[PDB]
């Protein structure tokens with residue numbers, strides 16, 4: 001079985017978290033730079049870590065992945081979080097109310113436009 | 122008392138009735154809810170949207186009463202309310218938790234995410250049952266947004282609405298953010314509409 | 328004029344990391360690849376075969392990154408990740424001189440005019456300049472990140488007063504060196520990601536540099552300014568300048584894009600089809616170079632193929 | 640594993656009492672960071688170097704000599 005241990009996975013996770021504008025989807029250049037960017041005591045571990053980072057680059061290039069939020073990711077999610085529509089979906093588009101909604105307004109004593117429509121079972 | 126300018130203004134009544142906050146749960150009804158008004162056919166109950174306003178005004182007075190603003194905590198494990206509580210976090214201190222509560226956050230002082238509030242606000246008491254329970258251990262008031270079937274155990278001030286709704290969670294969190302900011306000093310005009318758009322407090326599917 | 332399909336060249340067991348040509352023989356093509364070897368080709372000017380390899384060069388213990396040819400078409404130089412450079416001839420293989428002293432990989436080697444000396448940009452953040460006897464006459468520092476690509480400029484005048492080289496590393500900044508004084512003369516800043524390729528125009532005045540963000544932004548080192556920036560909207564791997572006519576080619580991730588830079592538009596967006604390869608990423612060119620005549624453009628793809636595009 | 644031979648010192652002594660003999664076994668794992676000879680850390684311990692944050696250049700600027 002080629003399941004990778006958590007020491008390999010977390011070392012790969014920390015490199016992705018920290019050095020996205022860096023190492024790419026090629027294993028050979030990733031191994032040649034993860035050796036000096038991280039002090040790893042074993043060559044077997046270094047190839048395992050550099051291998052899983054490349055597998056993470058392939059996963060990153062096709063949609064977002066969970067557990068990873070690097071420097072270009074959280075700025076992407078906040079820009080889409082900053083949607084300010086001008087259509088004003090809560091505002092009036094023409095309102096429709098039932099019979100039971102209509103007496104609520106006049107019992108409160110407020111003046112609103114209501115288009116009463118009946119609903120029955 | 123009140124200077125009688127905090128009553129339900131007509132355009133806010135338009136916002137509440139267009140975000141569909143007036144309709145509640147089905148013929149399920151807990152006796153802890155006298156906000157029910159004139160049960161509609163097809164098994165729908167109408168919430169007296171007037172009564173939600175003083176409860177939102179009263180809840181806003183609780184949050185503004187806390188000296189330090191970053192100790193109030195907004196909780197929403199519902200998928201319809203993480204954007205609302207995060208936007209509530211931006212406009213006030215209001216240190217949020219969205220998603221998983223990570224039990225041991227109010228107890229368990231050696232947690233990395235150990236938070237001690239003086240007030241918590243929860244979107245749904247049935248889905249944030251860990252938040253209200255942990256607040257029952259460490260002496261903390263809670264403010265909930267309640268349906269007409271919500272588990273109101275260990276729950277203080279409650280704002281009756283529909284947690285099943287899409288727009289109602291966003292608007293009520295927006296209205297709560299508006300009043301606590303007016304009371305604190307961020308807004309100076311009572312009649313101003315607080316020009317940031319109410320559609321900011323809405324979850325998105327993609 | 329439109330570049331079209333001419334043929335494919337299968338002579339490797341790895342990505343063709345470099346292509347180089349010499350004006351001495353138009354039918355020659357040197358190709359370094361990931362299989363620790365160099366394949367010189369012989370071209371016949373025919374259908375999809377296009378011809379056969381002539382000599383296979385072996386002796387490197389790692390990936391041969393960059394290969395170059397001299398003006399006479401005989402001597403060849405290879406930059407390989409085995410911390411050494413090797414000087415060959417296309418006659419009988421026969422490595423003349425090794426060049427050792429780098430403590431890490433070396434990306435790009437380059438030969439000056441008249442076979443005078445050689446420069447080499449390596450991964451130990453140095454630019455080592457070597458004699459042809461194997462003696463490193465000078466070592467240059469100052470790069471914080473390790474260099475990715477170096478090149479000499481082609482002097483339009485036949486050795487007017489001096490020769491200069493240029494450097495590009497992963498530090499988002501381009502150096503310009505005069506090795507006659509072993510001094511730095513120009514820092515070229517404006518890149519936002521790591522630069523992975525740069526190329527000087529045959530006119531000896533225009534410098535094109537490009538990186539991971541995929542912008543190809545231009546410099547004129549004669550005036551030491553910046554003209555503009557245009558993007559291929561994907562990662563780009565190598566650049567090439569046409570020797571005769573005004574074109575600029577870029578080896579992108581989606582494929583190859585050739586630019587007509589006098590009115591600055593795209594031309595045809597070269598996208599060859601590889602008989603499948605649908606689920607994963609499509610193969611892309613990693614190294615390309617225009618021919619001596621400029622009517623043929625060779626590109627080294629990842630799937631063991633050197634592809635040739637020729638104007639009609 | 641090999642770090643046990645590298646980082647752990649062991650000793651065994653016999654203590655004679657009037658009721659019999661006691662056995663004393665002392666194992667000391669030292670700090671790998673202050674090893675001063677051979678390895679400096681455990682093999683499974685990686686160390687990610689913190690980078691240097693840098694703002695974008697935002698404009699093509701030329702620095703000449």
Ligand SMILES: [Mg+2]
Pocket residue numbers: none
């Ligand atoms: Mg697969």
